[PDB]
Amino acid sequence: MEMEKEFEQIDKSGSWAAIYQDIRHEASDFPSRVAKLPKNKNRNRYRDVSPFDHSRIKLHQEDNDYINASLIKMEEAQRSYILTQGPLPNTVGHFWEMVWEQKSRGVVMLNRVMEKGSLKCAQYWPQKEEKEMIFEDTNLKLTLISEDIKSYYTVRQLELENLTTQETREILHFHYTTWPDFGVPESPASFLNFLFKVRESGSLSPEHGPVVVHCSAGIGRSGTFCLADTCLLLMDKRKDPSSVDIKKVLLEMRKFRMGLIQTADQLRFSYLAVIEGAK
Numbered sequence: 001m002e003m004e005k006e007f008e009q010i011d012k013s014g015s016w017a018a019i020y021q022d023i024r025h026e027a028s029d030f031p032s033r034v035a036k037l038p039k040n041k042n043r044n045r046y047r048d049v050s051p052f053d054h055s056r057i058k059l060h061q062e063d064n065d066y067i068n069a070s071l072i073k074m075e076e077a078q079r080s081y082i083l084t085q086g087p088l089p090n091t092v093g094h095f096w097e098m099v100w101e102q103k104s105r106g107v108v109m110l111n112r113v114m115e116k117g118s119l120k121c122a123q124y125w126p127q128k129e130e131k132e133m134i135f136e137d138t139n140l141k142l143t144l145i146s147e148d149i150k151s152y153y154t155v156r157q158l159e160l161e162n163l164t165t166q167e168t169r170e171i172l173h174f175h176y177t178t179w180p181d182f183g184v185p186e187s188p189a190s191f192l193n194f195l196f197k198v199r200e201s202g203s204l205s206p207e208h209g210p211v212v213v214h215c216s217a218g219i220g221r222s223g224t225f226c227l228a229d230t231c232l233l234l235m236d237k238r239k240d241p242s243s244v245d246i247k248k249v250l251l252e253m254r255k256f257r258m259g260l261i262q263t264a265d266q267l268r269f270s271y272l273a274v275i276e277g278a279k
């Protein structure tokens with residue numbers, strides 16, 4: 001169909017759960033044997049969320065190359081993303097090692113450190129200019145350079161130093177701070193504004209390594225971000241924008257990481273965002 005009329009037809013027929021279940025039944029199943037090795041148990045936040053072996057990011061290490069992170073490579077749209085879990089106390093040094101080694105320019109964070117009264121990820125960046133962080137396991141230093149706090153998001157300028165080579169790189173931290181503890185936003189307007197601030201920065205462009213995107217598990221909000229970005233780019237590239245099929249794009253992305261879009265409400269929100277962004 002076309003998207004906006006497919007949308008009203010699923011709303012009127014109340015069939016979001018059935019459409020979402022169809023996607024779950026058709027999604028790819030690839031092995032994740034490295035994720036399940038006993039030596040990696042304290043590197044995974046959730047036992048049911050693992051990177052596939054074929055698409056996992058490898059750390060440049062001989063002892064243990066494992067991180068819970070996946071490369072999503074979208075061939076027609078010419079976009080790549082790394083989707084990862086919120087870092088754990090034992091994996092903050094691995095996280096910044098990955099940003100360094102993959103030549104990323106941007107980190108996109110879609111969660112708060114505490115939500116629903118529980119910790120959803122480690123405090124993995126410095127909160128004050130004069131109190132830098134040193135990750136001794138991976139030999140990196142991270143400094144807060146500047147902060148811009150807005151109503152719906154915060155952007156930070158960070159300096160990452162490889163202490164082995166004394167090389168430095170600027171990293172941009174894009175923090176969406178207002179996703180609700182339960183459900184999805186009522187309007188996609190602030191999420192779309194945020195997506196276009198990340199684009200404007202150069203963080204999604206081919207002159208850099210892939211953007212690093214995370215939430216708590218790195219599949220639900222994180223999936224919504226990459227799915228909306230890729231669908232809007234395809235609508236600009238093709239002769240017939242109404243040919244873009246959001247369900248087919250999501251199944252392509254599910255070849256590279258399991259579980260992207262965690263609820264029927266996140267699926268409806270992704271349709272809403274693409275429909276409103278197209279205008």
Ligand SMILES: Cc1sc2ncnc(N(C)C)c2c1C
Pocket residue numbers: 058059060061062
């Ligand atoms: C430039 C690259 S790619 C790569 N893949 C696996 N291991 C590596 N190590 C640990 C040396 C590397 C390096 C140094």
Ligand SMILES: Cc1sc2ncnc(N(C)C)c2c1C
Pocket residue numbers: 146147148155156157
């Ligand atoms: C006024 C300026 S110049 C500049 N250059 C790089 N990053 C910045 N951010 C987002 C902290 C800024 C700000 C806020």
Ligand SMILES: Cc1sc2ncnc(N(C)C)c2c1C
Pocket residue numbers: 200201
């Ligand atoms: C002069 C420059 S460079 C640059 N890079 C990323 N974002 C920007 N804006 C609009 C927030 C800018 C501006 C205003």
Ligand SMILES: Cc1sc2ncnc(N(C)C)c2c1C
Pocket residue numbers: 148155172201
């Ligand atoms: C020179 C740059 S890079 C960058 N990235 C995100 N936000 C920014 N602004 C406008 C606060 C900037 C600026 C001013």
Ligand SMILES: Cc1sc2ncnc(N(C)C)c2c1C
Pocket residue numbers: 192193196276277
């Ligand atoms: C949904 C939004 S907000 C925004 N701000 C600046 N430029 C934009 N375009 C057209 C590239 C947009 C879009 C498409």
